[PDB]
């Protein structure tokens, strides 16, 4: 909502600078988005009249003019194509200081003497028009300062209104605000009734009174649409970002911006037996004034005649029933449309108008008549004509009514944190045109004016007081709380803890988009139907992720492409499994590593990362809440992973996740030449651990024995170690696998496993006989389960 400050001040004058006003507005909830001057600075430029012109005798492109400033006639040479006798123009006198330090001096153009300069809008920094001289109205006052006449000592203020302040979508609304803020008199335009010159009317029918409880119609006969829009109206509209199109549209726009009532004019000839305000028939077709052929729904309110639809009520007029070149008579319309009945209707047909915005936000239900009289006077002044009487159709039962609100002084004190004096409460509310009447001690009954569609509850009244008193003037307190000591369980590994662990272990945290390309989704998860968006921002951002791996691999390669070789990334976030019906949204922790095992350094070996490096990082995470023993890595298979280098992580049989080398085939498709290791874990299954349970320490020494075992190359080392524990007895305190050999010294289908077995008795020393007996029964067990041999 853009407006001229001068125009606002003509209704309500705060008596503070422009800067003070722009400041207070934002502090009261009307945020100023822009405040700019209307024109460039200049002096000595006045309204001049061209009395005569002659051809310059030694230059065909030049003219010699006799121009009056009301006090004296001056000779001025002019080259402008539009210069001619009778013209009222801005005359820069010898002395005049024009924009960007240009002083007017006496000149002698091709032998002819000149005593000033005639101006264009561009030369004066008024407009971008440099075509010819700025033709001022025929009735302009000659001698007057052009800055005064054109009211160039002005600013345009732009307000970003909140949807609850529909009332401020006019100068009438904004002035009312300014008067309430500053407690200053409001001088509204006096709108007298225009007496009817004849008795010609048209019938008006409210077929849908709930959607339209008030409709006003007037016949204006024999109008001259060739006549121009007056400069004052053009300037007022221009200062509100409204372009001058035609005198009739300019009046209806002017009235809407001045008072806040959207109005419309129909070609009288286009109304086939009076107006019918009704709901549209399903599939009824209307061609709008813009050319768009809309196909209407039965929920939409239309303005129709006895034959067809004429316009989409409160939003846009039809082409066949608008003003044209042929138009000799008008039919004016000023109505109130219910905010509910119209809410979203313009948008549903892909439309937005200044009328639609105002009616949806709410137009003063009593304003139609004042606005109708105002438009009538303006029409007669601009295009002439003879007015008929106003036709008012009104449904009293459907007119909006807001029940009186009861405001309690106690509740204001509570909310604000300080009391307000009854006189200040009353003064403030009354300034906003609210009807305050006492209703017992520290209680009133307030009535809402016809322009406010946002006040209905006690809290709305308290807001109003807070706002006008000043938010930053209100006290500051810290909320009270009856708190008790509390804490989460000790034996749990939370995500913040695990993130910090991985950081210590040399990882960098990544954040990737949840929505990915279906082509990528399909590579990491073949056959699965992704949960697809109906309205994705693009086609490659249409699939909700089922894994954090596509995103991580993508960020890893982005870095590899940017001269990075060692990449270690981790991410936490949700995965989306299944379709809407039974959709699972599960928080995951995933990581991706590539490049050298260690950073480049003098003391670091130049080896590359492998499966066991990633495994170490996973083990560390899984051991964070003292429950590592509950997890088992089993030879698995995953479509995105290397079948020879994949581990399925489990807990009590349940699936925790996967750990493995990215499938070489996937790398090819993704243009990845280096080996990359990925892991993904269900946090729900990682977080719970176990509280320490102290076990008494023995005072006696431990006994260790080492074993070298020959087993089938394809028997898992975890299977062998499990069997050992099963046969080691109660006293086994440690079992370490310190070497794996698969080379020349043995059969190529076999491997050697060097194991360290440690025992400790709680209450005595262990003798060599019992240890040797245990060692042999471990061996016998291994020969029977895996056909093991001692090296």
């Amino acid at each position: 909502m853009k407006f001229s400050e001068k125009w606002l001040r003509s209704w309500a004058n705060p008596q503070v600078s422009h800067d003070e006003l722009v400041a207070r507005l934002s502090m009261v909830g009307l945020e100023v988005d822009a405040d700019l001057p209307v024109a460039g600075a200049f002096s000595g430029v006045v309204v001049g009249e061209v009395l005569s012109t002659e051809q310059h005798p030694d230059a065909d492109k030049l003219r010699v003019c006799q121009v009056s400033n009301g006090s004296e006639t001056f000779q001025v040479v002019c080259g402008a194509p539009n210069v001619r006798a009778g013209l009222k123009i801005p005359f820069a006198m010898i002395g005049a200081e024009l924009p960007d330090d240009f002083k007017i001096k006496k000149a002698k153009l091709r032998g002819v003497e000149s005593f000033g300069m005639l101006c264009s809008a561009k030369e004066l920094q008024i407009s971008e028009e440099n075509a010819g001289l700025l033709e001022l109205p025929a009735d302009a006052p000659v001698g007057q300062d052009v800055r005064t006449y054109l009211e160039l000592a002005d600013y345009t203020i732009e307000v970003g209104l909140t949807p609850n302040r529909g009332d401020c979508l006019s100068l009438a609304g904004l002035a009312r605000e300014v008067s309430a803020i500053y407690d200053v008199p409001l001088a509204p335009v006096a709108v007298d009734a225009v007496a009817a010159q004849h008795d010609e009317t048209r019938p008006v029918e409210l077929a849908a009174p709930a959607a339209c409880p008030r409709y006003l119609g007037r016949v204006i006969r024999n109008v001259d649409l060739s006549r121009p829009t007056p400069l004052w109206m053009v300037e007022r509209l221009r200062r509100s970002d409204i372009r001058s199109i035609d005198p009739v549209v300019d009046v209806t726009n002017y009235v809407m911006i001045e008072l806040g009532q959207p109005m419309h004019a129909f070609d009288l000839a286009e109304i086939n037996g009076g107006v019918r305000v009704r709901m549209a028939e399903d599939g009824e077709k209307l061609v709008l004034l813009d050319g768009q052929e809309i196909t209407l729904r039965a929920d939409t309110l239309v303005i129709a005649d006895h034959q067809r639809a004429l316009a989409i009520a409160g939003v846009m007029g039809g082409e066949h029933s608008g003003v044209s070149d042929s138009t000799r008579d008008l039919f004016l319309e000023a109505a109130f449309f219910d905010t509910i009945a119209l809410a979203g209707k313009a948008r549903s047909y892909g439309l937005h108008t200044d009328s639609s915005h105002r009616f949806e936000r709410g137009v003063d239900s009593q304003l139609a008549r004042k606005a109708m009289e105002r438009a009538t006077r303006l029409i007669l002044d601009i295009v002439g004509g003879e007015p008929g009487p106003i036709v008012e159709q009104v449904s009293e039962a459907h007119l909006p009514k807001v029940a009186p609100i009861t405001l309690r002084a106690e509740r204001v004190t509570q909310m604000l944190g300080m009391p307000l004096d009854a006189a200040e409460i009353v003064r403030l509310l009354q300034a906003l045109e609210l009807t305050v009447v006492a209703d017992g001690e520290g209680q009133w009954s307030v009535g809402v004016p016809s322009h406010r569609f946002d006040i209905s509850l006690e809290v709305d009244l308290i807001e109003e007081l807070a706002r006008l008193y000043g938010y930053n003037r209100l006290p500051v307190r810290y909320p009270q709380a009856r708190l008790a000591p509390n804490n989460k369980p000790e034996a749990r590994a939370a995500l913040p803890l695990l993130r910090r662990l991985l950081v210590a272990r040399g990882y960098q945290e990544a954040i990737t988009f949840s929505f990915i390309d279906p082509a990528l989704f399909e590579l990491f998860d073949p056959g699965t139907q992704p949960l697809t968006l109906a309205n994705p921002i693009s086609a490659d951002m249409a699939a909700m992720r089922s894994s954090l791996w596509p995103g991580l691999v993508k960020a890893l390669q982005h870095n590899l492409n940017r001269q990075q070789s060692r990449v270690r990334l981790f991410e936490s976030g949700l995965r989306f499994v299944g379709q809407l019906e039974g959709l699972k949204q599960e928080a995951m922790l995933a990581g991706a590593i590539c490049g050298k095992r260690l950073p480049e350094g003098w003391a670091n070996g130049r080896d590359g990362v492998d499966f066991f490096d990633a495994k170490a990082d996973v083990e560390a995470v899984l051991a964070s809440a003292g429950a590592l023993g509950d997890f088992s890595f089993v030879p698995g298979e995953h479509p995105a992973l290397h079948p020879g280098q994949t581990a399925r992580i489990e807990r009590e049989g349940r699936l925790v996740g996967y750990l493995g080398a990215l499938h070489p085939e996937l790398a090819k498709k993704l243009d990845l030449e280096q080996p990359v290791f990925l892991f993904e874990l269900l946090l729900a299954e990682v977080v719970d651990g176990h509280l320490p349970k102290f076990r008494e320490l023995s005072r006696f020494p431990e006994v260790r024995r080492d074993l070298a075992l020959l087993v089938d190359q394809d028997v898992p080392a975890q299977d062998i170690l499990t069997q050992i524990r099963a046969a080691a007895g109660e006293w086994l305190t440690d079992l370490r696998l310190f070497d794996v050999y698969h080379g020349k010294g043995i059969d190529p289908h076999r491997k050697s496993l060097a194991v360290g077995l440690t025992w400790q008795h709680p209450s005595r020393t262990l003798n060599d006989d019992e240890v040797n007996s245990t060692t042999q029964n471990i061996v016998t067990s291994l020969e029977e389960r895996f056909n093991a041999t001692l090296r």
Partner: protein, 216 residues
Amino acid sequence: ERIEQCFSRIGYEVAEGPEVEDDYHNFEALNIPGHHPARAMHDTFYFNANMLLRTHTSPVQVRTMESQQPPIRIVCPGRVYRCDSDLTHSPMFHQVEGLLVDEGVSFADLKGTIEEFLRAFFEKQLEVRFRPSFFPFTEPSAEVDIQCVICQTGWLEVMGCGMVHPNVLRMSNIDPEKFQGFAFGMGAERLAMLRYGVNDLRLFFDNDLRFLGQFR
């Protein structure tokens, strides 16, 4: 992490909820009606007629209001989604939302809370300013400003807040006559950019090691 800490130190519980939500928890329960432009496919990502990607973390707070009776002291950090993306706005971003619901809660309590959190978070005794604004879920509502101390009158808009609208509590079976409440919201990337001097929002989602390595 830093925002959560400011509140969790004074009795606030961290709340989490789903990213794929229903129109009731995301809009209806927060006084955003059917015809509201925020509900349009121009601003909201939809799966079908009723299921969407949450536009804010407020639904987590709604789920808490239904599951329990006051007192309520919660902070809701999380990933949120907007359809109407560009250079200055991302289709996915993080936000934190707060909610306090108790018996004698005033606008002064809200001012005090917001003012002390900003001073704590920015580690400066900065000046805080409240401007009246409009939100469907709060009444009275405000836009919070801080001085350009962290670098057009020397003020910056950093967050919003307001007193929870009576209909919002009512809809979630909390009596507005007995209980009062305040809520707020703030953008994590916006705060990160002010704190660390980050210029381009696109840097956060690119994951270049040359950017990330600067926050070790």
